[PDB]
Each structure stands twice: as C-alpha cells, then as structure tokens.
Amino acid sequence: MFLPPPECPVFEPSWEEFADPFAFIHKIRPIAEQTGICKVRPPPDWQPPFACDVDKLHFTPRIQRLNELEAARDYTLRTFGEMADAFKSDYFNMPVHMVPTELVEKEFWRLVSTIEEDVTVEYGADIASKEFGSGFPVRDKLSPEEEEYLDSGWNLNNMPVMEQSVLAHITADICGMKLPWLYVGMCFSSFCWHIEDHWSYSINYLHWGEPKTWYGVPGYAAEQLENVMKKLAPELLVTIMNPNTLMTHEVPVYRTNQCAGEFVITFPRAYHSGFNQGFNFAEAVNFCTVDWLPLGRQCVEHYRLLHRYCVFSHDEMICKMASKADVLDVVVASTVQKDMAIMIEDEKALRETVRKLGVIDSERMDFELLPDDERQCVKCKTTCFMSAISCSCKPGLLVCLHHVKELCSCPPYKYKLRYRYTLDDLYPMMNALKLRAES
C-alpha cells in the first residue's frame, strides 16, 4: 500500500507577475521554501515553440535496475520513443494514454520494493545542451514566433546571465551550472534522492510528453532526512527510498505531477526524487540568487567537514564580483558586500592562528590560475583561494588554514603562507561594493 504525500503548492502568475522570474521567485519564497519544491503554470498564451528532428539527434541512455535502497546501445529520439511506448503498453496491456497516473505511481513503489521482480528501464539523462541543442530557441533563420521567446527570462538559457543571478558576471566555466541539461524519459525511469551542488536552486521545464512525478522535502528538514537514511541504509552514492518511510519518521514530504508546459522549482538544500510516467522531454538548469549567498558559504563549510570536493570556490566568486562592482545590480552589490565582510573577518582570524603556530614566511599567489585539482586541501579537499600553506619538503601540496598540521613532518618555520590578497587590499574592494549599493 502507498499513501500519496500531500500536494506541493501550485502558482498561476499573471503576466505582470510572470514578466520577471527572479522577482516572482522571491515573492513565492516564504511559502515554497516550507515545501522544498513548487510548480508554476505560465500564462496560457506563453507557448514557446519546440522543433526537433527526431531522426538526427542520437544518445546512449543509462540502464536502470529498479531496486529500493540500492546505490547499452544508441537510440535516436524516434527509436527511443518507439521503445518507450511499446514498453508501457505491454506492461499494462493498455493504450498509453489510458493508464491512470495514480496506478503508475502505486506500481513504481511496488516494483522497487519487491525482489522477485527484475524490471529494468533506460533514461536519456544529463544530455548536454552544448552537443544536442536546447529545447528553447537560441541565436545561431528563426521565425517571428521563435524570436518572441529568445529573450524571455523563463527561457532557461537566459536565466543564468540575468542581472539578478549572482553568476551573471562569473566568466569561469562553473561545470554545466550555467548551461541547461536535457532528460528524455520513459515509464518508470527515475532520479534518486539528492540535493543540488553548492545547495543551489534548480528550475525544470517539461517541453512535451507524459507527466513527471516529483517528491520534495523542505530545506529545513535536510539533516533530519539524512539521519533517517543513515539508520536504514548505512552503505550510502544516492538511492530510491519510499516517501512513506520518511513520513513515518516525521520528515515532511510533498508530491506533484508536472505536466507538459509546466515548471518545477527546487529551493536551496531541498531534497527531491521522482520518476517519469511515460515518454517525455525535459530541460533544467541550476541558479543562484542573492537569497542564496549565505547558504552558499554555509555549504562550503559543510563540504569541508565532510571532506567533499567543491565545484567552484565561493570566495573566488565573491572577489570576482567585487572587482566588477561598478556593473552589478545595486541589490546584488549590497548582498555581496555583507558576505564579503564575513569572509574578511574569518580570514583575519585564520591568519592570526597560523602565525601563532609559527608560520612566518609568506608570498602572494594567484590561486585562480591553478587548475582545480592543483589547489585542493590535502586533508579536506576544499578548493583554496584566499590562502593556503605550502612546504618545500612536499612540493606542490597545499593545505587550507584549518589543516596546517596535516601537510609536512617539517617544523612550521619551513612553511610558507600563500595568499591572494593582503587584508589592506581587501577593504577597498568591499568599499567599491558599498559605493555601488548606496547609490
């Protein structure tokens, strides 16, 4: 038996509300952050055209064996869809459009929990927009109808580069966290419980096909969910776990059926999972708002405790924006300035601590020029930028300032503090942000 979780919130914005996606996301945040995910239906006439040749775009999908708590060939879009439809109609012995969504959901959770069944499916997942092309129109002759949607904020190609996005002036290739990803689904293909890199937002648009079923958990319950999954499946790596099991342990869970033409938004640190009802085509991108900035700093601290790799350096992003203060949105400048003040005070305290450990020598270093795998802390794997410690006895190795004692057997007077900026360089950068924000 499966008891469906309660429905997440659904918004139907007016044209005035819809005109600015970041203003609308900030508007709904008080409600939606209490449920982790939400759904947005655009105005009825917002109808971006989709054009793909089903025969000229190829992919190799991942094979999925349906098993709860458990951690190939080439298709065209046409041949995948023929495989997908025949699978679903043979599975239920019905036409695909007659299979109720409540029954597919019930059957999915039965399937993953029975070991007597060996059902396997395929999922065209994490296809890069760069090779395959986007489902939204982009500049590359386009029709006037496609030109109408080129500059829409809800065209997911635009959202990362708008002024309210805090990566808009970041030119580093912060790994496809600025380019959309595509997902070609079939019946029962799924995504496991997870949160986004650096606790970012995500936004997902279903271009066409049968619905995508979601489950979501609010950001405030993240550690509660993690404690529950540690007790029940310590081997974890992500997995499928029945939402009724989380609910039994007092974790709040919400559901929705996302249909063609609808958006789903996930909020910072919000766990989510789901599965596809049938053949469909989705597109998604990550993004970061000013709301997110202090959570982004908390996230990198949490990664350090766990010894987890970073996708980018948060401090490097902050300093890059400071160096472009004159072209930032004024509310962006204000919020970056507050995060930078915390950064500088934490950095000041860390440098005093390592000096009292006996590190005396020092030298400026342009960390941003090193490949990422050449500037990770030996102990905690954090990506260094503000500063690190090196030792002549172990060339090329770095520790962050929390892990001075983990580098060398040599005494600390043989160490060197490598630093990007003096404290005296940092305070004028923060003042430029203040001037920008106060005007």
Ligand X SMILES: *CCC(=O)N1CCN(CCc2cnn(-c3nccc4c(=O)[nH]cnc34)c2)CC1
User: How far is 426 from 397, CA to CA, in rounded Å?
Assistant: 26
Which of 380, 417 has the CB closer to Zn ion?
380
Closest CA to 282 of 256, 262, 305: 262
Q: Is 175 in the site for ligand X (CB under 6 A)?
A: yes
Contacts of 215 (CB under 8 A, 6+ apart): 5, 243, 253, 254, 255, 272, 273, 274
Q: Determine which residue in the list 207, 324, 403, 416 makes contact with Zn ion, applying CB under 5 A.
A: 403
Q: Is 74 in the site for ligand X (CB under 6 A)?
A: no
* Choices 9-17, 113-121, 175-183, 339-347; region in contact with ligand X by CB under 6 A: 175-183
Q: Is 191 in the site for ligand X (CB under 6 A)?
A: yes
- The option from ligand X, Zn ion, none interacting with 302 (CB < 5 to 8 A, set by class) reads none
**At residue 5, what is the residue type?**
P
Query: Is 17 a known ligand-binding residue?
Result: no
Q: Is 125 in the site for ligand X (CB under 6 A)?
A: yes
- The option from Zn ion, ligand X, none interacting with 336 (CB < 5 to 8 A, set by class) reads none
- The option from Zn ion, ligand X, none interacting with 408 (CB < 5 to 8 A, set by class) reads none
Residues 193-222, one symbol each (x = binds Zn ion by CB under 5 A, - = not), give: ------------------------------
- The option from ligand X, Zn ion, none interacting with 126 (CB < 5 to 8 A, set by class) reads ligand X
* Choices 37-45, 174-182, 221-229, 291-299; region in contact with ligand X by CB under 6 A: 174-182
User: How far is 155 from 138, CA to CA, in rounded Å?
Assistant: 9
List binders of ligand X among 218-237 (CB under 6 A). none
Q: Is 303 in the site for ligand X (CB under 6 A)?
A: no
**At residue 160, what is the residue type?**
P
Which of 293, 404 has the CB closer to Zn ion?
404
Which ranges of 323-389 would DSSP assign to H, the alpha helix? 330-356
Q: Is 380 in the site for Zn ion (CB under 5 A)?
A: yes
Q: Is 400 in the site for Zn ion (CB under 5 A)?
A: yes
Closest CA to 127 of 181, 52, 166: 181
User: How far is 367 from 383, CA to CA, in rounded Å?
Assistant: 10
- Say if residues 219 and 33 touch (Cβ distance below 8 Å): yes
Q: What is the 3-state secondary structure (H, E, C) of 256-305?
A: EEECCCCEEEECCCCCEEEEECCCEEEEEEEECCHHHHHHHHHHHHHHHH
* Choices 146-154, 189-197, 367-375, 389-397; region in contact with ligand X by CB under 6 A: 189-197
Q: Is 204 in the site for ligand X (CB under 6 A)?
A: yes
Neighbours of 138 (CB within 10 A): 15
Strand order in the sheet with 212-216: 190-194, 272-276, 212-216, 254-258
* Choices 16-24, 334-342, 399-407, 408-416; region in contact with Zn ion by CB under 5 A: 399-407
- Write out the DSSP string of 5-24: PPBPPEE---HHHHT-HHHH
Copy the structure tokens of residue 199: 């606790």
Copy the structure tokens of residue 143: 């029709």
Annotated binding site for Fe cation: 194, 196, 272
Annotated binding site for 2-oxoglutarate: 123, 202, 204, 212
Residues of the shown chain interacting with Zn ion in the complex, contacts defined by CB under 5 A: 377, 379-380, 400, 402-403
Residues of the shown chain interacting with ligand X in the complex, contacts defined by CB under 6 A: 125-126, 175-176, 181, 183, 191, 194, 196, 204, 212, 272, 282
